[PDB]
Symmetry: D2
Subunit: 252 residues, 4 copies
């Protein structure tokens, strides 16, 4: 009952971190709208969790997002929290292998999709004194190799979170982001599968953290519920969920 | 029941932020040992809250701290979380009005007291896979005027938190800190009372945050319970509880 | 003679910060290619400074940028440093007054133009063990009110700087950024002119810094020459040129 | 002639980073007072460099520091820059192997010695519109294993730098710090000699940086001359001289 009576939209909530965030909010008492461009995971999640419903939505399509917000209000009558989790990490790419075209397409998902849903949701979040939670990445803050477009998109998300927090503070709407490090998700597994030695890639990813393991979607989910339900004096913060990967010296 | 069956020590828990942290852990199901050098607030808190007990302890006295840990184990049989909140902010002091003597005494409370209890507690925290929460300050990160010794002590606490997180990660013991901004406490009120216009000082402190208010001990307390009970992939982080004071341009 | 025999390209070098950076490199002994989309300032600068030449180039046009690099090599035979300074700050805009369209156009100048020139220049920078200097902004790090798209673009630039520094480090090519705060430029003056009271806006901007003044293009220029010529162990850093605006509490 | 006619005091200037900073300022045209507790390196440096003189001074002894300032004024008539470089990194120590006693002694050198000279020098720095440069460490910001007291002292130095910058800004006195990463010095070599395999320790230290090498005292020296002579809009900044060690993921 930490977030009972509240309505939450989670983009990319069909699998991975997003699904962990969906489950955490449902466990907190909220009703959750699962937004995803793929039907498979989200539809099954809606059958599994009472209180969660699935709405097909590609956050890069402005009309999809308009319909997502209006359907959320029509079906549930309020909107308290938007979790902008939809995003993608391309396979490793040397800077000379990247293109302005691919960069624009990644900006469209990782940054403008977050911008568009937030914009459409804010009138309702103002009515509810709701809040926005953006899922950025640690590599937005510290960089990463062979990921220039991805890193740039998460740098923008983290900075945009702070700008929006300033604009919305007079209306009592908080805007925060979570920066996960290595979290074991289908995306991580897919990316590891492309490497010459997948098992070696995964063990390298585990040892990137002083804790010696990757994180779980449920741990990102707990951080999100905290920001929504108990962080009333937090706005514009970047909550690190990284297992300490940013600490100390390492083999670079 | 988020932290049921767990045992928490809170230093400086007799009033202010520490008392808010005590109440939050008790509300989470934990048993809490209130450590304070002053009897008045802590003893009343123990009478008020079942599950909380008061132990007189000056964290600058190594034998006081040794007795605090041994009494906690003797009476409760385990130790899961240490919250190093004891600390003091002197009145405003121009750098030429400070002294090496006063600097050393402030280091003794704000930094070495935290170091001493953490050291004595870590053998028991390792047994429990417990965690350490240090209460630092936003001004450790961004500086503050007329507070050179205070700022230095909180810079050390925040850095020490990261060093300790690295050392204790192989043992599964997490070490994190909370950096509050302006929180309305008896200390803030006492400090405002020394100003020529106390009400003007307080309104200036409120407007330092884009949220337009100071924070509450209960909000620091919620952040502490989160770090202890639900932040299992967080170590070495600095959790800002500041109302956004660090964001954007201001009259400096 | 600190940077004698070296060849530097400065985008947006016709006025403002870019012109200050041009002058600083010329004063250091380098030959400088001034890139700008407007002829007026850049052409006059080329007449004024021996060693500086002006090449008309809109960094949002990929063929313009291709021609800029090839003409630089054809005329000067090497390329040692690229300063990505072209950029624009729109007038204040509430988040609900922004558009995805305007956001994309600002990304095209502030981020993709930097990405495009850097990409085309890197083969030559690798030959010279040259370096990249991106002009970002303090508000990328701390946010700003009524500037969501602008803040996001500078957050991306600062993060991209770190990602690129990692990719190019094996080749001895350093990538750094400068984050200016309030610098008195034609852009600042133009923006102040739109305010109801321009003089009040300017005095507010001066007092945003503990130093009590805005910065000068020449001071950004000195920081750029340092990064190019004397910072051989610096890569991926964000050099703040802000007069301390990020320090301490302020009226927010 | 970048800093001609100026007078600089460098503590711990007899070897290592301090000696590199001495040489850089002498090369810039300044007169430099070398302060060190050991006679060997400093006296030889004074014989080698016209314009540099050696004054025996232990920065932990307040009367030594008083005499250092008064002798500097008596012999050279002004004081423009103080570089607080004296400091020590103990051998690796697990947290349970540290002591409050050793912690206090390290605070006395790494933090209070910097505080004491800065305090005694500020009246003269105000007359000259001079500046303060503190040598902190990257591990103050990101932590380090087996170095809890050391990390805490550098966290304090970096924070104190910002507090002092705020206090001294109305007087036109800038206060900045440099945070080096792994720099090859006699201290690094001494520490490596204590390891079971010194050569393995050194190669690990080199690979901690994406640049693949450690830094040089001369590179720290160039950064110091920049801050003193050309960074007139920089105050309270932390200038990283780390070869990118803080960037990206590493084996932790
Ligand atoms: N996995 C990690 O280690 C990690 C670390 C840091 C940040 N992140 C971020 O976390 C978020 C989720 O990552 P993940 O690992 O769970 O990925 P994932 O690929 O496992 O899941 C992402 C989900 O988003 C959906 N999605 C993708 N594009 C969409 C679109 N246009 N509209 C709607 N839904 C869309 C996908 O269908 C999928 O269900 C991303 O923003 C990612 O950048 C991940
Ligand atoms: N109040 C704020 O705005 C603010 C902001 C940032 C950080 N902080 C930090 O929060 C902590 C608590 O601050 P507060 O405002 O609640 O202060 P407070 O003065 O209201 O309460 C501090 C408590 O600690 C106790 N204490 C002091 N010295 C002690 C010692 N030697 N041994 C044991 N207990 C001791 C006091 O008796 C008191 O009960 C401090 O570490 C302070 O630096 C406060
Ligand atoms: N002025 C400040 O206070 C401040 C603070 C932080 C960051 N910045 C950044 O500094 C940079 C320069 O700012 P400024 O104040 O000097 O601005 P300015 O408007 O005075 O000058 C910018 C110059 O870039 C040119 N330019 C614009 N679009 C271009 C394009 N497509 N191709 C080529 N040239 C183009 C303009 O013609 C102009 O000559 C920008 O990146 C800005 O974001 C400025
Ligand atoms: N070497 C590195 O990789 C590194 C990295 C980051 C920060 N640092 C910092 O740089 C500074 C210099 O380090 P280094 O590697 O050159 O060390 P070093 O041991 O080689 O030289 C330090 C010098 O300071 C002197 N000194 C020590 N105690 C003193 C005292 N009480 N009074 C006066 N002089 C005293 C020593 O005699 C010596 O000449 C220190 O503050 C250190 O923490 C070093
Ligand atoms: O596919 C890799 C991991 O992704 C996570 O989202 C799932 O919760 C796990 O069951 C799975 O092991
Ligand atoms: O004294 C100022 C404030 O301090 C806080 O710790 C208390 O919870 C408040 O009741 C009080 O208003
Ligand atoms: O237009 C405002 C300022 O812009 C700067 O780029 C110029 O160097 C100044 O001469 C001018 O005062
Ligand atoms: O002793 C290790 C290194 O220390 C530096 O201060 C010296 O300049 C070098 O000559 C030496 O190789
Ligand atoms: O942002 C990240 C990251 F930091 C590490 C791995 C993946 Cl798959 C990501 F998407
Ligand atoms: O650390 C702080 C702070 F940031 C503001 C006010 C007080 Cl009373 C403190 F102790
Ligand atoms: O980036 C900035 C800033 F921080 C202040 C003012 C202007 Cl005009 C900018 F472009
Ligand atoms: O501060 C540091 C560091 F970051 C690395 C090595 C040494 Cl010897 C130091 F003193
Ligand atoms: Na359901
Ligand atoms: Na009780
Ligand atoms: Na010319
Ligand atoms: Na000499």
């Amino acid at each position: 009952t930490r977030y009972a009576g509240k309505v939450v939209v989670v983009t990319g909530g069909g699998r991975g971190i997003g699904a962990g965030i969906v489950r955490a909010f449902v466990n907190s008492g909220a009703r959750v709208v699962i937004c995803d461009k793929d039907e498979s995971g989200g539809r099954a999640l809606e059958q599994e969790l009472p209180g969660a419903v699935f709405i097909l939505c590609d956050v890069t399509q402005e009309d999809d997002v308009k319909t997502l917000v209006s359907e959320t209000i029509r079906r549930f009558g309020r909107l308290d929290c938007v979790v902008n989790n939809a995003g993608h990490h391309p396979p490793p790419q040397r800077p000379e292998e990247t293109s302005a075209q691919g960069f624009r397409q990644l900006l469209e998902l990782n940054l403008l999709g977050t911008y568009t849903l937030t914009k459409l949701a804010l009138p309702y979040l103002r009515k509810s004194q709701g809040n926005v939670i953006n899922i950025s990445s640690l590599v937005g803050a510290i960089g990463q190799a062979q990921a220039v477009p991805y890193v740039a998109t998460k740098g923008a998300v983290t900075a945009m979170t702070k700008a929006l927090a300033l604009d919305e503070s007079p209306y009592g709407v908080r805007v925060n982001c979570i920066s996960p490090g290595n979290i074991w998700t289908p995306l991580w597994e897919e990316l590891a599968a492309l490497m010459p030695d997948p098992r070696a890639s995964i063990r390298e990813g585990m040892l990137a953290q002083p804790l010696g393991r990757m994180g779980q979607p449920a741990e990102v989910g707990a951080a999100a519920v905290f920001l929504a339900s108990e962080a009333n004096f937090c706005t514009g913060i970047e909550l690190l969920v990284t297992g300490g990967a940013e600490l100390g010296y390492g083999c670079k």
